[PDB]
């Protein structure tokens, strides 16, 4: 119903290590939430892409294969996530604290009017009791990292905004498959229906090189 | 109908120089487009704010005054622009290539699925003929700056995506008022209807300091 | 009774080289002092951590393992070393002159009323005769370094204040194990005990 | 009484701008707390230093003046603040988040068992109620700042530990005197007695 | 016939100080050479630019004013100086050793078959006797600088290749006007003529 | 014929990785153009340098070997490429976007009246039709890269100026030999004749 | 017979602000040492250099005027100080902690087998008890500055090695003249007797460009 | 009577790779100069140091073993080289362009009034015609490296000043022994006769902490 998504970053046809680390962590979290683990991958020429991803315990892999999706540019990838997340209503989204993450994260979260904790150092599942309105939020994503000038390790929660989004650096989480034969549904979408066109033209105007008139 | 907006950055109750420079440039451009010059300002305690802004030739100033709008945070300011621009459908938006600009620009443009040229060095009004589909786009914003490793000064256009957005560094454009008595409509909006709530809580979890069990 | 401690810095699960270089130097000094070498580690997931440390000749290894002890943050790691050191009363504490050493060292030495000496180039054991107090101090930690620049070299001692605390840069000291089978007690402390003294509360805005 | 101290950082005889902004900010907090504003300065040749400090509304200025107090070094300045704060028992201490501040703040707060919050963006006075214990803490120093990066902001409090210590960057707070003829006590302390504590001897070997 | 040129660097409408320092040095050299001082400026909105330049003793000022000549970009400014210098045949061209000088200088000197000498510390006029060619070269630009490091100093000359090109760092040469009323011809060139030789086309992807 | 040259940058006797990636990329472009792949290397002690270059599918390797060609200096290396390219009239020249590349690329492209496009992210072969002139330009070097920053990408072409010159950063292109037994001519040029052009004399005064 | 020297750094005919500050401080020190203040200046076109120097209370000004002494280069200035200092046997030499000071100081001290404390922060006169052999050294230059990683303000002394040398950054000491009418012996030295020749030549070897 | 010296830098009992490279290059040069190769080593615990040095073809190895020579500090190592070089009168001295080289080189050259070319890139033997007075200097050390802002590969020579000194970075020359059985005079010098005393003492003055 409301699942956990991981954005899988693609470099030269290969899914990044940090992404696999987050598939692994996503699996653990998904186990605890009793929900599904879904992945998104966007690039060009992704026929046997499931094979780097499904073994990690991915229930549903969303594939956006089109010639202008690689290399990464902000608008295409952003609109894909924003649109997909509008339909799927993920409760959680994780991605690598990479150069792409540092770009894609802020845009997608802003567009979905959601939270984002960057460079999380641990991810747990936990509750939060709001004494003020007297309610208990259950099964929130605990976004854990050093805080306040590195004085303590604090936890951040987004009680209401979805998705709860977080990034993690490479090497923080271990990667580990479930089974090389893990079975998962692969969905190859029509990029047209998800991606947003370019609409920019680079010109060099002639009059910019004509001597200024008196 | 479709006007030119300038986001006015606020620091300690004062509108930034780069913002005034862009009000001035916006005026010139608006003159050429025969459209209105509108401004947006968001902060706290903005009673006599029109007085730093209207003299520059601003037809319509939009004021968002609420206690959590200053200092700047990305989500509030972003949602304000995104929502206001959804109603007003500006053809153009300019803002300062500041720290705030470098944050706000990308979010707002991504959310409106629009263009953005940062650090424009000149702004003109011009046309673009698309030989391919055989059409002529008239009165586009020419976004001019050094390009391709600083080899030449090129012009960028967004033939279809709106708003056409651009940022400019401080000191690039001159500032100059129209008349100290310039008359413009001041609109004080209900922030509630435009701004997006916080929904994040910073915690320090007790169990994070309890010795790990064997 | 009063031993030599070494703070073992941890990154991505691995005890840093400077720390291991100081365990080796510590072992040498401890031998000369006829005392034991103790060590401290704080981190998350340290079930097997003893394996990286004990072979260097550590007689006692104090292990603090909690979710919020990694990565390093100033307040928990400072409480731990201060509370632990008040209990154990070490005569000496060594620490790698790192980004972490540079933050933790002054905090810990200040809380225990001792003057840290950063970036030593030698450490020896020696005596100091203090004619003002009339007495002769035996078995002090000579903390040796250049005064400034590099040619003028001096020896700092703390005749009375404890622990004698110093840092050393990576690669100054040789690292070398004692034996892969080195034996030392490994204590896994209760963490809350050692950090809840800290008065640091977060409120909503 | 339990007053609010501010460390006035010195350079080439001129109290730094950060400190003046903090004497200003301090004054308002002191007004709201109904306590006094005290200030500390340490250096050399400070015959009329009060001229730069008192006008900001300082009720009591503690002056330490010896050859060895300038330029700033870590042990003497830490000794002085620590010993003084042990006697005066301030409820708050403020300090400019500068090179000097980043070295002195941790050393002093650690020796006084306080948790320093660096780079605050706002300071206010407010109440924190500890529900579990059933005790309302009144007139606490709200230490406000981003948790990290910039968008997520919280307030830190220390309900029991004293002094509550914060630092602020130059230019966060505005600076503004009360009156060029503001009057307040100027104590010129005996330095050696505040510094001779530290145990740090230099040997020629 | 064959004069001394100085490239005048422009930022935010203002001729940079290094450029003005080189107009002064140029004026000195030109006087010794018994030739004229000419200068080049490329930018946007240079109606009054002559006012910043002429007083330094410039006999001729070549002005290139177009929207795309500001800020500086490698290809237009290189075409201009190359085409202009082919026409005028300067015996010398000076240029400020700046971020701009460092990009433009090698491009321009390469296109005109001369070896630029960067970062000179002196410039003089002198003779060179070349026994291989049998001849004696008179009135060459001694381009004086350290070989490397700083103690070993040498003099470069280009006996035949023109223009003799050198750069100098800001603050090496004194700047000083000749007279506020200094007179020189100001030519406003047609820009396209001097830049359309460049073959650089942008296409859509 | 009009072939495709690649400058093979040298360090401590080993052709740099960027160049090998460019010999690889060059080979494909040369295949698509149906021209030959040529390469240039300049340094000292290059007796069996062909061993590192030829396997990438180089048809002709020009070798310049003198004491003064290593380490890289600007005038000799620029002379060599410029004179050689004047004789061979290459249609394309590729070079690694490195410290050496950023100094040599502009110098060489300027002397050959070509516009260098630095830091390309892709190279392809394609047609540009000049509508206004009525001429279709065939098999041009598409020099693809971001206009600035990263999201806005265009292709630059030089429809008439030769060589069409581009640089690429290390790691953009993959490197991959054709065969360890790929055969191709290895010319060992007379250096002095390619370098003696430059007019640069050092005087002792 | 053992005086206090100050190296006066020249830039474009003008004695540097740091050098004037040290003339002043030097005056004070020489006053307390009951010795004369001497200064050294080295450059070209120094016909009236004595006018910006003597008023600070300089008893003797050694002037080295030669075409090759400006701009500063290491060997001439080092041999000048070293040679002169061998003849004069200063007890103290002070120098501005500048780009030149950082080069000149170490070269001169190494050649004279003397000490050198850079970036001093105060200078005093003081005594030192060599407790080990019970000897008291009187009236040494206390070279005072922060030490041991910014921990403490320490004092360096050189009981025996001469001269005692110290550099100081600009703006640390005040400058103050004694009187525009202060009188001093101005000695214009024969440069040939103190400086050493260049003896180096930059060459470009032809065969270095010939094919192997 | 005029030989080629090489300073062998020691770290923890081991002669540095750059120093061995220069022993090798030095061997070649001394071969072409028809002179002997000599080396200098300075440290503590050098009982068998000759074993890592002699095989490179070192005819004479001057050993300075003293408790205060390790770690490297400026004055001892400079006085050793300067004093020894005054006795031996080398025509060439070579040194690794290291942290030590960058300190030792300038101090020694300044004190000996010799040249010094840092970061040489090749070393050759060659002649120089002083065209001005028609004299030919034979068999000079060609000190070769990039010059004038990375424009040209130039060659520096010191026709008269001795020794001719040059540093070289590690990895520029190959190292290659002559024979494990190469024989050389190993001289263990009386350190007192070459080194100079410390004479400095770090103090903390009590009144510096007393109220003004
Ligand atoms: Na203690
Ligand atoms: Na307390
Ligand atoms: Na020419
Ligand atoms: Na051509």
Cβ-contact C145, C156 below 8 angstroms: yes
Q: How far is the CA of E84 from the centre of ligand 4 (A)?
A: 19
Cβ-contact F37, F25 below 8 angstroms: no
Q: How far is the CA of E92 from the centre of ligand 3 (A)?
A: 11
Cβ under 8 Å to F: H residues 153-172: 153-154, 171
- Interchain contact F72–H (C-beta under 8 A): yes
Which of helix, strand or coil describes residue C73?
coil
Cβ-contact G103, H102 below 8 angstroms: no
In a 13 Å sphere around the CA of G181, the CA atoms on its Cβ side amount to 0
- Looking at CA atoms only, how far is residue G71 from chain E in angstroms? 10
Distance CA F22, CA H71 (A): 48
Beta strand segments in A44-179, E: 60-65, 92-96, 122-130, 135-147, 152-157, 164-168
Contact A202 F151 (CB under 8 A): no
Structure tokens at A107: 């845009």
Distance CA H165, CA H5 (A): 10
Domain CATH number, residue H109:
3.40.50.620
Q: What is the crossing angle of helices C74-88 and D99-111, to 10°?
A: 40
Are chains G and B touching, using the cut-off of 8 Å on CB pairs and a minimum of 3 such pairs?
A: no
Give every CB contact of residue G11 below 8 A, 6+ residues apart in sequence.
Answer: none
Q: Which ligand is nearest to the CA of C86?
A: 1
- Find where tokens 């004694």 sit: G178
- Interchain contact D14–G (C-beta under 8 A): no
Cβ-contact D35, D123 below 8 angstroms: no
Distance CA H145, CA H153 (A): 5
Cβ-contact F30, F36 below 8 angstroms: yes
Cβ-contact H111, H86 below 8 angstroms: no
Beta strand segments in chain C, E: 4-7, 10-11, 14-15, 37-43, 60-65, 92-96, 117-120, 122-129, 136-146, 153-157, 164-168, 185-188, 201-203
Query: Which one-letter DSSP state was computed for residue E17?
Result: H
Give every CB contact of residue B134 below 8 A, 6+ residues apart in sequence.
Answer: none
Which of helix, strand or coil describes residue C66?
coil
CA distance readout (Å), F140 to A139, F27, F32, F124, F155: 59, 16, 11, 8, 11
Q: Is residue G71 reached through a cis peptide bond, with omega within 30 degrees of 0 on the bond before it?
A: yes
Q: Which ligand is nearest to the CA of E115?
A: 3
Smallest Cβ–Cβ distance between E200 and the set B121, B122, B152 belongs to B152
Residue of D nearest to A118 (CA): D149
For the CA atoms of A39, A42, A47, A52, the dihedral, rounded to the nearest 10 degrees, stands at -40
Are chains G and F touching, using the cut-off of 8 Å on CB pairs and a minimum of 3 such pairs?
A: yes
Among D198, C110, D44, D193, residue whose Cα is nearest residue H204: D198
How many domains in chain E?
Answer: 1
- β-partners of residue C92 are C4, C164
Which structural domain range is residue F177 located in?
Answer: 1-205
Other C-beta atoms closer than 10 Å to the C-beta of F1 total 10
Other C-beta atoms closer than 10 Å to the C-beta of E45 total 12
Cβ-contact B162, B91 below 8 angstroms: yes
Cβ-contact C82, C111 below 8 angstroms: yes
- β-partners of residue G96 are G168
- Interchain contact F201–E (C-beta under 8 A): yes
CA distance readout (Å), A83 to A88, A132, A195, F62: 9, 34, 8, 56
Query: Which one-letter DSSP state was computed for residue B211?
Result: P
Which of helix, strand or coil describes residue F62?
strand
Distance CA G64, CA G194 (A): 9
From the centroid of its chain, how far is CA G36? Answer: 15
Residue of E nearest to G203 (CA): E154
CA distance readout (Å), A7 to A17, A100, A167, E2, F29: 12, 11, 10, 66, 35
Which of helix, strand or coil describes residue G40?
strand
Distance CA B213, CA C47 (A): 10
The residue among G132, G149, G159, G164 with the most chain C CBs within 10 A of its CB, best to mutate, is G149
Contact H212 D66 (CB under 8 A): yes
Backbone angles phi, psi at A208, to 5 degrees: -75, -5
- φ/ψ region of G199 (left if φ > 0, alpha if ψ in -120 to 50, else beta) reads left
Q: How far is the CA of E106 from the centre of ligand 3 (A)?
A: 14
Cβ-contact B149, F143 below 8 angstroms: no
Backbone angles phi, psi at E63, to 5 degrees: -115, 120
User: Which runs of consecutive H residues, i.e. helices, occur in B4-130?
Assistant: 17-33, 50-53, 74-88, 99-111
Contact D151 B73 (CB under 8 A): yes
CA distance readout (Å), C49 to C11, C39, C43, C64, H206: 12, 12, 10, 11, 48
Structure tokens at B67: 């206690």
- Looking at CA atoms only, how far is residue D123 from chain C in angstroms? 12
User: Which runs of consecutive H residues, i.e. helices, occur in chain G?
Assistant: 17-33, 50-53, 74-88, 99-112
B68-94 exposure pattern, b = at least 16 Cβ within 10 A, e = fewer: ebbbbbbbbbbbbbbbbbeebebbbbb
Cβ-contact G147, C149 below 8 angstroms: no
- Find where tokens 């709001």 sit: A130
From the centroid of its chain, how far is CA A141? Answer: 15
Cβ under 8 Å to D: A residues 109-138: 117-119, 131
Between the two ends of chain A, the Cα-to-Cα distance in Å is 69
Query: CB-based burial of residue B133 (10 Å sphere; 0-12 exposed, 13-18 middle, 19+ buried)?
Result: exposed
Helix (H) or strand (E) holding H40: strand H37-43
Residue of B nearest to D155 (CA): B202
For the CA atoms of E112, E113, E115, E120, the dihedral, rounded to the nearest 10 degrees, stands at -20
Structure tokens at F50: 């062909």
In a 13 Å sphere around the CA of H81, the CA atoms on its Cβ side amount to 35
The residue among G72, G111, G143, G157 with the most chain H CBs within 10 A of its CB, best to mutate, is G111
In a 13 Å sphere around the CA of C205, the CA atoms on its Cβ side amount to 24
Residue of E nearest to F81 (CA): E110
Structure tokens at F182: 């790929």
Structure tokens at G188: 């214009």
Distance CA H30, CA G20 (A): 51
For the CA atoms of H176, H182, H185, H190, the dihedral, rounded to the nearest 10 degrees, stands at 50
Distance CA H1, CA H60 (A): 13
Distance CA G21, CA G175 (A): 4
Backbone angles phi, psi at A29, to 5 degrees: -65, -45
The shares of helix, strand and coil residues in chain A, as percent rounded to the nearest 5, are: 30, 30, 40
Query: Which one-letter DSSP state was computed for residue A213?
Result: P
Q: How far is the CA of F91 from the centre of ligand 4 (A)?
A: 10
- β-partners of residue C47 are none
CA distance readout (Å), F176 to F28, F53, F169: 11, 11, 17
Helices (H) and strands (E) in chain B, counts: 4, 12
Distance CA G96, CA H112 (A): 25
Cβ-contact D189, D63 below 8 angstroms: yes
CA distance readout (Å), A205 to B133, B143, G154: 20, 11, 67
H101-119 exposure pattern, b = at least 16 Cβ within 10 A, e = fewer: bebbbbbbbbbbbbbbbbb
Query: What method was applied to determine this entry?
Result: X-ray
Instruction: Please report the DSSP string for H142-202 in residue order.
Output: EEEEEETTTTEEEEEE-SSSSSEEEEE-TTSS----S-TT---EEEE--GGGT------EE
Distance CA C141, CA C138 (A): 10
């Amino acid at each position: 119903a409301n699942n956990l998504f991981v954005y899988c970053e693609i470099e030269e046809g290969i899914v990044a290590d940090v992404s696999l680390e987050l598939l692994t962590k996503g699996r653990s979290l998904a186990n605890e939430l009793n929900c599904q683990l879904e992945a998104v991958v966007a690039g060009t020429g992704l026929k046997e892409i499931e094979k780097q991803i499904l073994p990690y315990g991915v229930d549903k892999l969303h594939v956006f294969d089109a010639e202008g999706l690689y290399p990464y540019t902000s608008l295409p990838h952003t609109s894909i996530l924003v649109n997909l997340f509008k339909e799927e209503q993920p409760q959680i989204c994780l991605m690598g604290a990479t150069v792409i993450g540092r770009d894609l994260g802020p845009r997608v979260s802003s567009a979905l009017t959601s939270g984002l904790t960057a460079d999380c150092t641990s991810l747990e599942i936990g509750d939060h009791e709001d004494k003020k309105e007297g309610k208990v939020y259950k099964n929130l994503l605990y976004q854990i990292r050093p805080a306040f000038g590195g004085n303590i390790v604090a936890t951040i929660v987004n009680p209401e905004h979805r998705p709860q989004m977080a990034t993690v650096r490479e090497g923080v989480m271990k990667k580990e498959i479930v089974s090389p034969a893990y079975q998962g549904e692969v969905i190859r979408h029509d990029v047209k229906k998800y991606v947003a066109d370019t609409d920019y033209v680079v010109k060099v105007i002639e009059r910019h090189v004509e001597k200024a008139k008196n």
